[PDB]
Design a protein around this ligand. Structure first.
Ligand code: 3MI
Ligand code: 3MI
Lengths: 115, 115, 115, 115
């Protein structure tokens, strides 16, 4: 998978399961077009978001529906969602993992980009 | 100030200075309307974003221009910006401090809500 | 204050109040000597840890008692404490702000060094 | 592996490779006894730290030699190392992953505890 998303829960100390993940790509007219989506599994990942042929250079947005996740756990959250906006750049072979660590009033995100 | 933003640089160990901060508020037609903007000072904060009378209930987005910040420092970062989307003043007026900690391939955000 | 500590709670969206902070300084015999201690106030900071004259060059450890904090809130957390070990004043006197953001199964720490 | 350590680099956007990881267990006399150690691989993990028979309940310390890692990259770091101190508790089957995300002036750590 050229693009992987991993969601972790800082309160329970576990992968964040059943979280909706939406991916968008910026079109030529500067609007967000739905690209891929899924629900995280027991591993905190929504497996199989895209393919190497589809995941071309461009500007992408990964939206994680954190509010629904915290509401399901009964914890009052601050954010409506967590969004990660980045440019995908070909510079030799690349694999992107967008990882997010969630708390009710905070989130962290990092990118792990490997050859 | 009912809405404060503090931006920190995890590489240099300093406030992130001269960073552009843009705030939007969601309109009834579900579009994002410009609400306020500023530039961080030597303390990593843009002083005087809004007022008590203007900062009404709503869904707000704070966009911190991290890409321009890292580029000005000679680093090609991963993210286009650090975003923070939240509902404000839904249980009465509060003071919100949005803090962001920046690295070239990661960022964290947290909210401190007082009153 | 040459050494400031700010503790934030990522679950409640507030400063972490009544948290014990212990500071040690490494002695010539490679053992940790007690240096200062305090309790965070309503702003999440223990006011007046040390002075310019006492805060000499050395290797310091700031231990934040996160386990007692979470237990007092009814949470059984993962960590015993949040630690921060650093060399201070090696390139002349500086002001250090050690910030920690806490969750039951995670914590982050950052330093802001000024002067 | 009942105990796994994963180290990520927030500056390069990759696993932190060739990082020394030291694990200690608190003995009955309240001193830190070396338990296991290794160097992170290309995946950011020092594979095979312990076994299920050896990894009993107790207080453990995971020390990550961050300073040597940043010095090898030529970046001035703040911390002498990153330390994670926690209690291992049997409450049905458990597998512990200690993850750390590194920056020169900041580190984050989380625990992912699975059945
Ligand atoms: O020194 C102050 O006044 C001050 C204020 C707000 C602050 N927010 C942080 C913070 C944010 C994140 Cl997302 C992660 C971590 Cl470790 C720290 O540090 C602050 C310090
Ligand atoms: O054990 C694994 O496979 C695995 C993978 C990706 C991971 N990303 C993290 C992580 C992310 C953020 Cl944004 C902050 C922190 Cl403290 C940690 O931990 C991971 C563990």
């Amino acid at each position: 998978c050229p693009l992987m998303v991993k969601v972790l829960d800082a309160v329970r100390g576990s992968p964040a399961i059943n979280v909706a993940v939406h991916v968008f790509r910026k079109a030529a007219d500067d609007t967000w077009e739905p690209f891929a989506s899924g629900k995280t599994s027991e591993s905190g990942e929504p497996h199989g978001l895209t393919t190497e042929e589809e995941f071309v250079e461009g500007i992408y947005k990964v939206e994680i529906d954190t509010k629904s996740y915290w509401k399901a756990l009964g914890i009052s959250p601050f954010h409506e969602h967590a969004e990660v906006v980045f440019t995908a750049n070909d510079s030799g072979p690349r694999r992107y993992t967008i990882a997010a660590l969630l708390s009710p009033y905070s989130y962290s995100t990092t990118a792990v980009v490997t050859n």
